[model samples]
Target: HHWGYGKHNGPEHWHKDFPIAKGERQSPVDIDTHTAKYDPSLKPLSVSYDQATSLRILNNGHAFNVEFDDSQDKAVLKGGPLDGTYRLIQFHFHWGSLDGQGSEHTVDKKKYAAELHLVHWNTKYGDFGKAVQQPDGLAVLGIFLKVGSAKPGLQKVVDVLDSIKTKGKSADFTNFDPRGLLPESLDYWTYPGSLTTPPLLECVTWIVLKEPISVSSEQVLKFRKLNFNGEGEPEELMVDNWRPAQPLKNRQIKASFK
Candidate 1:
């Protein structure tokens, strides 16, 4: 692979292939609560997910992705900082080897055990590929995953990991409610930023949740078991598969609630 989370092909090397890596709006930025501007006009984020829309869970070598069928707006996100409807395409996690740090976006430099990204594409721009080229093409709902009590909400996704342990492998992951994984509070920090990984396209509207959801340390261990390399290739554990925070530059973080 030309880009990956390794010393040779990791985030550091991505700038070579993906020149946008040095762009002004790259994501996974640190959120300073004291400094993030509060916008009273920002609407509360709303999401309606259909259990039947969930497709399969796949190991894409970067992270484990639970795919969704987005042909229709069966599962969609509305309101918040968004103008029109955005369809839920897939969801994935970013984590580290230890429980102490893994989250891509940090709060006042505070990192969580893991971070989840619910990816959506703006119907205004048509398909995901075309959406990637526009400034208003995509919306990513980011939720931090902390270690506390057992999070049964996350159990269904974790239960299927063993089958997709190698790169490009996926198994059926149907009838799952993505909404159950969200926290009760929709309070969030919205900003214009690019995707965390490569191609680092500057087209995403990021909505990072304020409150965090809990998952057991055991669940996180399962996350580390998946292999970055495909079958017949050398085994390389998928650990610390997250990018470091990028510069805020000219962007301002908008808080939904003051």
Candidate 2:
């Protein structure tokens, strides 16, 4: 094994790099098994990113952001894969300093090579902002990106990276299916958690899929080579833009239908 620094090494090291890191309620805990009361309320939901729905694609420089309107016909998550139909407010990614590894969430305090976050909210609660305030309002679907020969499902999004390659230059895309971005297996690990970012409210229900999607070496490079220019500064490239993992705070993590 190799020696390294950061949260995985221990929370103290993580706090040193990012003081707020330790503040996050969920920091990628392992998906061991489920023990929650079998509340039928935990029923599944079926959603679709059909052709009819309008897909707004933006070029946020560092990555591509996709938005779907639930009011639209095609973007509905009816009664299959989801509990209540949730509207995809915005979808983004969290990569590492290098292609090898860089992300806020880790498995067993171990960082995956890369990570992608699909942010969505319960339409039943109104808009995305409002939904995030509730305990089960926010659902962040996480996908682990590992180096491999197979092309990751994310290629569909990365192909559009050229359009917004520069900072603050985003384009809106339509008639796209958001479901295609998800991994095949819906089987996931769940836990009552909060946003990986700051103000880390304990209101998130993280559904980290057991399986990961594949991405080619080139695709991973595209994300790692992005810059955060929303500030309108002189286009600073964001390499190693990932924060170390956070502490679990004894949060109970469980796997689905295992």
Candidate 3:
């Protein structure tokens, strides 16, 4: 509640509450493919997400996260830079009011219309709470969303965004297969990083996809319709909810492709 994507309490003020925001392993770093090393040891990233595992959609005063059934290994990501199975816990997006500057992590310092984070957890941790403290506890797949055409995957989320228009609002969301959100190729850049939000825990292994999926500009406008405040509070659109790219000190970024 104290932290948000606002002028008074945005990323600039986050380090005040969460000191780890300024750590070495911070996330949403700019990934220059020219500088990224191709690691043949990394296997092709594999993921299988079931439609019914998507439980609900809610705006949590930050981003609207679609909670998944992480209690079981039904929908998950495996292989790639991950050691074992990592279950998809939730999925959310970070965007801006305009088309050019929204996504957290950039490709060669170029921004996108938005960014999608498919958050997952390591089954080895046994619990989400326990997973947050370990270095390799989470794996986040960051897919950039570029403005182009209407994508079938996001329609489900956009259709229901009006229902959960305000923070703390939620609706039953099921039968939505998140795999529809991915681009044609799974080739991605991988690195050790942290979460892109508050409580910016330095615990995620980031797998950023090379190809971006498309979204119509109108579809993006629908995303901007959601409110950052409660139904009665001062009105603020939930746009530009992305933390700027952090430092990439003492870390190496690898790619799945040559």
Candidate 4:
């Protein structure tokens, strides 16, 4: 009984096995910008990356990930609601079958075409596994994707999609800087949330960028070609892999800009 995005095992059914699904602070919350508080104390975000630290891209039976070498501080995320430095581990995405509705987190209940998640672990925890479930252990930078101009930076990532079309598939993908994919504005909204995936750990400090990046319709469609199943397993098209927005509960969302 493995977890997945199927109707029988989707987000609604997660709580049956992963109890944290019903926890107080969950992820992919509906971001009501009008209600978000402007926090002057929030520091500006700082990101540094060494393209050499990029390892490869792999399809993990869930999503395609561009993993980074966290063994050293080659790539790091600091500031913007963090107590210390967080090492970049990997980056992945979530999208829907249709362009109008796919992003995990919505703005005023408006869903974008897709969402990107850059996962990092606090150096204080020493390792990603140990930090993943602890409070203030993980930091994820969320970026929304809209259908418009073709993003040249993303084309680099999209070009490698064919090599890892199925689960467990991987290919060499180095010297690629993740920063090139970022939007012009670093303005963001921050809140406490859990992983949108299995284990559903309530450990992440989510930093969602207000400005979304652009991607062509064709580029977004390429993401649908991926398979959730492995080579020998029955092929399952990997579309609509996004989790719905969860209840915000009593938590407060802090914004870095007005």
> Residue 27: error of model 4 in Å?
0.6
- For candidate 4, which ten residues in a row score worst on lDDT? 46-55
Instruction: Give a tens-digit lDDT track for model 2, residues 39-88.
Output: 33344545455544546666554445677665644454333234676655
Q: How many residue pairs clash in each candidate?
A: 0, 15, 0, 0
Q: List the global CA lDDT of all models.
A: 0.90, 0.60, 0.91, 0.92
Worst 10 residues of 1 by lDDT: 43-52
What's the CA error at residue 100 for candidate 2, in Å?
A: 3.3
Residues 32-122 of candidate 1: C-alpha lDDT, one tens digit per residue: 9998989988876778785339888989888989888888878889899999989999999999998988999999999998999999999
Give the Cα error of residue 160 in candidate 4, in Å.
1.1
lDDT sort, best first: 4, 3, 1, 2
* Model 2 alpha-carbon drift over 4 Å, by segment: 1-24, 27-47, 51-54, 59-63, 76-83, 150-153, 230-235
The local distance difference test score of model 1 is: 0.90
Tens digits of lDDT, candidate 4, 1-258: 588889988888999999988999988899999999999999989987754288899999888999888998888899999989999999999998898988999999999999999999999889999998698999999999999999998998999998898999999988888987899999999999999998889999999999999999989989999999989888899988889999999899999997
Candidate 3 residue-pair clash tally: 0
